[PDB]
């Protein structure tokens, strides 16, 4: 039960009656307090048991360190960990894992790695949490090659990686343009029965899109849909941006229609790529319809949107409409630039 207040009341009573509490009494209470996040009181009882000649054990220390770890009190958890080792108390996997997770989360990777080396030397065997924690930590720091080396090591030790491990690595590799390796980890992940998620697919599609390998990006987009994975605003913007750069305007407009059909909300980036694409193609009636639609949908145009339409309208001799959008642009607080002015001056001077 979570009846801690009564447990504490009974503890006060036994001490008044002259009954001496033992390691069991203290461990239960400290464990109860640690689980309730009442760590100042858990630490008072730990000090009290020590003064009373009661000797703490692995459970006492692990409960306190777990509790202080969950409270963001990392420096105090590391101090108790040094203390437990001085008293000859042997730390276990839980102790090492809670500390490495805390250190990892704080970006204290040199110390997280020293504790990981130490647990191996003391015969403590790391598990999926130990490795995942370190991989995530190293990943966030840009320390990708070190993360990859621990991934190789974890597999040699028969520790099975999960979605988190793979997704952290694929993300880091895709960001660095190391696509062939990202794709290799993706193939391995599926082969081992690990199920990719929206994060796995979006990273690879972003990566492939930014490298202009769009047929592959589209193949993976089709695959995620067949696998029951749901594309989001990022998946769609990446593909639209990618196909837009490739001059594949009609396919980018078809995905834009698809995304709205699936209730995915397009942003300023989606609308802009399309408006520029259409503008560049002289498809001004359609660029203007999308411009009207983004306003009805709450999407606020910026200087690129206005410039594209002005440059577009200008090139088509549609000068009075270009001038009207120029006025609107200034009414809406968007600041014109060299391009906006030079486009209008050309058309007017012509």
Residue numbers in the entry: 18 to 367
The authors write:
PPR proteins are RNA-binding proteins found predominantly in mitochondria and chloroplasts. PPRs stack on each other to form an extended solenoid structure that can recognise RNA in a sequence-specific manner based on the identities of amino acids at positions 5 and 35 of each repeat. To bypass these limitations, we previously used consensus design to engineer artificial PPR domains (cPPRs) that are highly soluble and, via an appropriate choice of amino acids at position 5 and 35, can be designed to bind RNA in a predictable, sequence-specific manner. In this study we have discovered that cPPRs bind not only RNA but also ssDNA in a modular and programmable manner, analogous to their RNA-binding capability.
